[PDB]
Design a protein around this ligand. Structure first.
Ligand SMILES: [Mg+2]
Ligand SMILES: [Mg+2]
Ligand SMILES: [Mg+2]
Ligand SMILES: [Mg+2]
Ligand SMILES: [Mg+2]
Ligand SMILES: [Mg+2]
Ligand SMILES: [Mg+2]
Ligand SMILES: [Mg+2]
Ligand SMILES: [Mg+2]
Ligand SMILES: [Mg+2]
Ligand SMILES: [Mg+2]
Ligand SMILES: [Mg+2]
Ligand SMILES: [Mg+2]
Ligand SMILES: [Mg+2]
Ligand SMILES: [Mg+2]
Ligand SMILES: [Mg+2]
Ligand SMILES: [Mg+2]
Ligand SMILES: [Mg+2]
Ligand SMILES: [Mg+2]
Ligand SMILES: [Mg+2]
Lengths: 210, 147, 102, 203
RNA sequence: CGCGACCUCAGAUCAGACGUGGCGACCCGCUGAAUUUAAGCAUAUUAGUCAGCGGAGGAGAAGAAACUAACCAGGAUUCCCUCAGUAACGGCGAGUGAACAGGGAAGAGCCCAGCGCCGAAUCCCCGCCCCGCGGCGGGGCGCGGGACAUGUGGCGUACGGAA
RNA sequence: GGCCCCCGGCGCGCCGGGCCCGGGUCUUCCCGGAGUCGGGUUGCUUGGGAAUGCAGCCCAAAGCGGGUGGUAAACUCCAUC
């Protein structure tokens, strides 16, 4: 029974929940296990970045996130095609490739080509045998580093372009933003009917002739 | 800390602070929010006016990020930028006015609470209030819409 | 007179240049192939027509073509499938009519 | 190629030809036992799309299944309980008849490992099916690398666990908004995830 | 009234293989209550929960979009944090109740049928030799059997593919 | 820290086999899983609400088609598999 003021509150402890309580006494033991396993995987992939493969830059979806930029899942085929890396090979040099990515705008594409180009510059492809054929880099850039790269490879940093102080032309000052927005709202709202009434009026003008 | 709790001080006394006329029985009201309409009604309708009943429109697949529009007041617009933009300005003598990209700092709308200091600006933002616009103009600045 | 890009209204959103890529090969599925067409109609002269199809042809002949569609919708399910079927049946019926006139 | 023809013909099931044949097949099948090993696949085409291959150690049992729904096995009515659960007649099994068909083929030939099934007709009383089975221990399967996944002992009794194409369908899993139940492994697992008090160390 | 092909079917203590029961903490498929709550009760709730049956593995299941979204767009599955006790359901009462985005753990992608080309170019079992043999394999040689054109193998599968 | 056993795992040599295995550029061809989808339905199920998912029964497809695009339907553009 409720007594004088309080949130009329609904707890969800009506099922047999104590049968399915999940404690976290693992977690330290877990955290270590991951960490060992992590250090092992590094050591196995000896001069290769611990990170993984290189991954594309990509914008988030939705109005909310929109402005931010992450690492994506893998580079698109167009981006590999333009960079000039054979897709089947790109996997073998540590370049993530997804093939389900569309590519809508050319601003996101050229950026991601630039990424791969830069990667290919600062990559040290070892030759297959110790005897050195084409592609494989010099023994200088090899002895000076068979070094792993700690952290994510060529990390993405969401960055801003500084706008210098303008002078405010008599035109910026002239603008009526709030009004403009109200107008722009109503024209989206009313576009469709306006077009139907105009289509009606056009039919009335043609009907007047016959 | 049981040490501090009340049951330590109740030891010895019969009823354990629950009285002996009426006792501590199991669920004398009913369990939980039972009787909202009948027999607990008065509490509900003098501390939760409007619990019972429907109202307004349903909306099936609500996704909150569509309606994302965090606001900021003129009150503290200059807070977004380093003091030395607001200082290199009220100085300078070009009549420059520094830009304030509000969307960079994580606010989409610019609403209009507060006095804005007499010092020109260019506020870039997704949305503006009417008053926020007006105040900005009165300072001697320019609102700027961005996508 | 100052056309700032807006986040709201008709020609809204961030103004970005569009690449016009090759459309994915996945998108061309169901496109009727010359050899598949031949197979399809090669079998429509072996197997012939279904019973409901035949009944609809008889309605269409009579020029009672709404009742034909009402029948096909109840039979097939949707309107759009029923309409697309009624056109096929009307095409078949026409190519019989052209074939008879010789 | 002939298979595409066959395929398109079999889609004309209301046709005069295929209806004749289906009636004659279905008569014939009805006049045999509920489970018999077909010497070759009634539908060669279908079998290939489902992964049959006309080599040794692929088998095909044609299995009959009784049709219609599932009446509640309780004496008289007497589903004693709240009258939500009073139903006995108009209620319906979760798995399909085709799955039941496979499950029975699987039951019978324990060594054999159910791959996949297809349909061959239906009377009022029965349905008919054709379950492709495989020996996991016939060298021609063992040594062929592309099949030797079935010889692994995780694939014991696929049909029993809800893992053939048919018995997958009851589980109610696909990508996208039309699912969510089964957004872990399976129906049961999501419930499990959703009804765990995760009780953290620090809270 | 024979002999011979094949088809469909039998029988073998035929040669050689496999399956059967157990365990069941975790896992997959079915099946499925009622105490209980609602201060009564029938829908609801308890709960797709206990009991019941089935089948597994060292994990299982899931998984390479007939996906999300509606953005300047993301990009298999699983797991955690969040979303969120929210959108929604509900004698709109009791009560119940997800998903996307975002940040992480991890990270890996592939193969057929078909359509086509290639003298079936493929497979299984026999038997003789050389090696190897306590996870029955390699190489060679047999007009030695069989499977297979009612389709085996190489190329190839939507990220396009072939010539 | 030592010695002795055994076993693993990775490095080099020799032999036996297999294995003549690319990429871009222009042309000519090639292309998709049916009693399934979808509809009606009844029963269970779901937060999923003029049907989230699974079922039985009846109907029962197409190929610039099909599916999705969280309020039933028709017209219409888009998006997305
Ligand atoms: Mg990582
Ligand atoms: Mg007290
Ligand atoms: Mg007392
Ligand atoms: Mg009292
Ligand atoms: Mg009840
Ligand atoms: Mg289905
Ligand atoms: Mg067992
Ligand atoms: Mg009660
Ligand atoms: Mg009571
Ligand atoms: Mg009572
Ligand atoms: Mg329930
Ligand atoms: Mg149990
Ligand atoms: Mg598995
Ligand atoms: Mg799939
Ligand atoms: Mg997801
Ligand atoms: Mg909150
Ligand atoms: Mg529930
Ligand atoms: Mg082939
Ligand atoms: Mg329910
Ligand atoms: Mg709608």
């Amino acid at each position: 029974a409720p007594s004088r003021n309080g949130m009329i509150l609904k707890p969800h402890f009506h099922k047999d929940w104590q049968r399915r309580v999940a404690t976290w006494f693992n977690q330290p033991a877990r955290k270590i296990r991951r960490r060992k396993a992590r250090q092992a995987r590094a050591r196995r992939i000896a001069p290769r970045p611990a990170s993984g493969p290189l991954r594309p830059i990509v914008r988030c979806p939705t109005v909310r996130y929109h402005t931010k930029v992450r690492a994506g899942r893998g580079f698109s085929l167009e981006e590999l095609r333009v960079a000039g890396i054979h897709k089947k090979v790109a996997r073998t040099i540590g370049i993530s490739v997804d093939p389900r990515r569309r590519n809508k705008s050319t601003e996101s594409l050229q950026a991601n080509v630039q990424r791969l180009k830069e990667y290919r510059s600062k990559l040290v492809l070892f030759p297959r045998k110790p005897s050195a054929p084409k592609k494989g880099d010099s023994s200088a850039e090899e002895l000076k580093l068979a070094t792993q790269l700690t952290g994510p490879v060529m990390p993405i940093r969401n960055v801003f372009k500084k706008e210098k102080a303008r002078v405010i032309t008599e035109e910026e000052k002239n603008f009526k933003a709030f009004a403009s927005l109200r107008m722009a709202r109503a024209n989206a709202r009313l576009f469709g009917i306006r077009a139907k009434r105009a289509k009606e009026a056009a039919e009335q003008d043609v009907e007047k002739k016959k | 800390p049981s040490r501090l709790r009340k049951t330590r001080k109740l030891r010895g006394h019969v009823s354990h602070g629950h009285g002996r006329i009426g006792k501590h029985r199991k669920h004398p009201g009913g369990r939980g929010n039972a009787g909202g309409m009948h027999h607990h009604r008065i509490n509900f309708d003098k501390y939760h006016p409007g619990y019972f009943g429907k109202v307004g429109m349903r909306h099936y697949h609500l996704k909150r990020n569509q309606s994302f529009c965090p606001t900021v007041n003129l009150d503290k617009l200059w807070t977004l930028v380093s003091e030395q933009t607001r200082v290199n300005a009220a100085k300078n003598k070009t009549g420059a006015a520094p830009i304030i990209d509000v969307v960079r700092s994580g606010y989409y709308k610019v609403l209009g609470k507060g006095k804005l200091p007499k010092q020109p600006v260019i506020v870039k933002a997704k949305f503006f209030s009417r008053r926020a616009e007006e105040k900005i103009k009165g300072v001697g600045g320019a609102c700027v819409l961005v996508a | 007179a100052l056309r700032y890009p807006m986040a709201v209204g008709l020609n809204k959103g961030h103004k970005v240049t569009k690449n016009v890529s090759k459309p994915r090969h996945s998108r061309r599925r169901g496109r009727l192939t010359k050899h598949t067409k031949f197979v399809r109609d090669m079998i429509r002269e072996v197997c012939g027509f279904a019973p409901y199809e035949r009944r609809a042809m008889e309605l269409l002949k009579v020029s009672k073509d709404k009742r034909a569609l009402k029948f096909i919708k109840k039979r097939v399910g949707t309107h759009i499938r029923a309409k697309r079927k009624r056109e096929e049946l009307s095409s078949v019926l026409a190519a019989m009519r052209k074939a008879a006139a010789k | 190629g002939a298979y595409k023809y066959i395929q398109e013909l079999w889609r004309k099931k209301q046709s005069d030809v295929m209806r004749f044949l289906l009636r004659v097949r279905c008569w014939q099948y009805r006049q045999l036992s509920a489970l018999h090993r077909a010497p070759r696949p009634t539908r060669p085409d279908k079998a290939r799309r489902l992964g049959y291959k006309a080599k040794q150690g692929y088998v095909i049992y044609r299995i009959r299944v009784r049709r219609g729904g599932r009446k509640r096995p309780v004496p008289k009515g007497a589903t004693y309980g709240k009258p939500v659960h009073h139903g006995v007649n108009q209620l319906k099994f979760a798995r399909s008849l085709q799955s039941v068909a496979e499950e029975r083929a699987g039951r019978h030939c324990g060594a054999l490992r159910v791959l996949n099934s297809y349909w061959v007709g239906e009377d009022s009383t029965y349905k008919f099916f054709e379950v492709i089975l495989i020996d996991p221990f016939h060298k021609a399967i063992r040594r062929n690398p592309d099949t030797q996944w079935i010889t692994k002992p995780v694939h014991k009794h696929r049909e029993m666990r809800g893992l053939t194409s048919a018995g997958r369908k009851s589980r109610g899993l696909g990508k996208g908004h039309k699912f969510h139940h089964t957004i872990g492994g399976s129906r049961r697992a999501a419930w499990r995830r959703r009804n765990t008090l995760q009780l953290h160390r620090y809270r």
